[PDB]
Scaffold this active site. Structure first.
Site, PDB file in Angstrom:
ATOM      1  N   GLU A   1       0.816  -1.214   0.000  1.00  0.00           N
ATOM      2  CA  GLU A   1       0.000   0.000   0.000  1.00  0.00           C
ATOM      3  C   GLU A   1       0.846   1.259   0.000  1.00  0.00           C
ATOM      4  OE1 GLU A   1       0.735   1.764   3.022  1.00  0.00           O
ATOM      5  OE2 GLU A   1       2.009  -0.009   3.156  1.00  0.00           O
TER       6      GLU A   1
ATOM      7  N   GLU B   1       4.613  -0.287   1.381  1.00  0.00           N
ATOM      8  CA  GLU B   1       4.743  -0.357  -0.076  1.00  0.00           C
ATOM      9  C   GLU B   1       4.785  -1.763  -0.649  1.00  0.00           C
ATOM     10  OE1 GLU B   1       8.192   1.682  -1.528  1.00  0.00           O
ATOM     11  OE2 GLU B   1       7.687   3.573  -0.528  1.00  0.00           O
TER      12      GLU B   1
END
Lengths: 346, 346
Positions: free
Chosen positions: B171, B314
């Protein structure tokens, strides 16, 4: 040997400060990549890496030898398995070979004392056909231990000339978790019961005998905890001495060495006792499922990266962690910087 | 969606028994490769892998979105960082890009709700320009959550048609550790204080406000812990919904998904609540340095392989663990067998 130990370089604080500054400016919240950042800085400080975290060629050195203590019934694996597996190492079918190939590393199999005829393809550095049974006397003479340390140390730093910048250490030797436990007990002052594990699937009923053998080994030999060479020669083994030798050689060479499991932790305790300057060059790989692992690691003040419940040995854990070392280097050299994206964080 | 959930396949016990038998016969003491063995058997049971542990193409899906709760002062990163980093993802300079490249994986950047103009190169699945501020009402409607789950689920299983067999989830969204903490509190019944962390370097003095915001979010929305979609739509975010969607899609597809850190654990709790059948397909990567990590993992009964003190997000942790999945496959297919070396062990 005294020269060897004397010439181990201290880490380069200047390169490390430069590394830290660069990592802080990368595209991420400061400190967010945690141990990957610390690992990159540790690498920058090793003189053989030329001021920057990098990995060139990789090698896993597997030290093979037999132990006279096998006769005390402390291992269920047939003695010949040492010789058979050493041959398999040359065919690429063992666990460390498969994992090393996956990491792009080459496996060097070194015979430092297998009790069998020489195996073609294996590097011959044999001291004798197996070491003495530590339950009734010493594994070897101090002279033999010192000479093997030097020979392995030189072989290791010589590889640095061929482009190797990252080493992994491993072993192969039936019954070697017994001398390993003896060494850990002596160096950490822990009772044998607290560090003797099942090794290669020893039945729970045979543990008591294994603990007794370790205590006898210590009582009969009286190894001096402050003299790592005294400890290795009395209650260690040729494989253990060889692993210690890879660590001293990598350190002398100013290069990193990845530890493996319990056997390698025993060797690292000896290496750090002999020369504390070796410590900055050691990198843990995994947390061995061997009983005495926690104690050995606490004395080395090391926290492994991988928790895989592994206990094979052979240097398999070290190979499994090489990608992590390469990842810290990739982060360092390939990530973008905050300033270039005009990102300003508190 | 009900069809989707209904059609998630159960693991293939037959392929797993065959896998276990093969692993037991490899050149090593039975069980000595520990979690690498268990991982290989887990993989053998996933229908999309065709009865054997294997890895073809790899993809990390990064779900990007903004959060209205950013206005409550729960994050020190400027809001625009979501949009800027999403663009950087297309240039290959972010942490997950560098680590994915090292693992040979491709990064798919998906905009599910960034509060900015569309970014060329990013997959557009945006629900709205940021979700609602959960401190005063819901993040989104149930309809919006269900539709995004379906769309992401389909996109994910479609990649399976292009040769992808291993997914990683990640994310990008400033302030998203706030809804993540709210979800973890609701699903595990833990107090907000026990799961609210510093996220992207939030000052210690600003923590109290963050905890208060999480409690307000829960009090005002009254999410039902037994309805994962209710929870996601009320106190979650578009990025969180998207990650849950990758998990449902990989499961429907009978393929493995590697989790990342705290945000992904929140999404996994929601996914398992919605469809318990998803559980066998999830694989942990690392143990996030976020405060609520231990609690979330205990509820998922998961033990990560890597302890790197990482907290970037991430999908960087997921990428870092892909080599471990490939290692379990290499062990399985490339190691030699005991019988071929005439080695017999008790």
């Amino acid at each position: 040997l005294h020269a060897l130990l004397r010439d181990i370089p201290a880490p380069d604080a200047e390169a490390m400060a430069r590394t830290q500054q660069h990592i802080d400016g990368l595209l991420k919240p400061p400190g967010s990549l945690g141990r990957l950042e610390t690992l990159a800085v540790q690498l920058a400080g090793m003189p053989g890496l030329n001021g920057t975290p990098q990995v060139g060629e990789k090698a896993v050195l597997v030290m093979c030898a037999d132990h006279g203590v096998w006769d005390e019934g402390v291992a269920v694996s047939p003695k010949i398995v040492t010789a058979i597996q050493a041959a398999n190492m040359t065919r690429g079918t063992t666990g460390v070979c498969v994992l090393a190939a996956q990491a792009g590393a080459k496996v060097h199999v070194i015979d430092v004392g297998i009790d069998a005829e020489p195996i073609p393809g294996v590097v011959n550095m044999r001291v004798a056909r197996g070491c003495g049974n530590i339950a009734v006397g010493p594994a070897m003479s101090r002279l033999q231990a010192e000479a093997l340390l030097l020979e392995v140390s030189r072989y290791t730093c010589d590889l640095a000339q061929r482009g190797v910048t990252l080493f992994g250490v491993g072993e192969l030797g039936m019954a070697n978790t017994t001398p390993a436990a003896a060494m850990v007990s002596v160096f950490t002052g822990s009772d044998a019961k607290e560090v003797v594990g099942i090794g290669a699937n020893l039945p729970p009923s045979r543990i008591d005998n294994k603990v007794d053998v370790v205590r006898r080994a210590i009582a009969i030999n009286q190894p001096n905890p402050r003299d790592g060479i005294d400890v290795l020669s009395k209650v260690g083994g040729f494989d253990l001495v060889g692993m210690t030798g890879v660590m001293l050689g990598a350190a002398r060479c100013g290069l990193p060495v990845l530890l493996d499991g319990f056997l390698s932790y025993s060797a690292a305790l000896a290496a750090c006792q002999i020369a504390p300057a070796v410590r900055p060059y050691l990198i843990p790989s995994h947390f061995s499922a061997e009983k005495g692992a926690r104690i050995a690691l606490a004395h080395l003040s090391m926290e492994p990266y991988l928790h895989m419940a592994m206990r094979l040995g052979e240097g398999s854990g070290a190979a499994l962690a090489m990608p992590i070392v390469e990842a810290a280097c990739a982060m360092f050299h390939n990530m973008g910087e905050l300033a270039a994206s005009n990102i300003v964080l508190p």
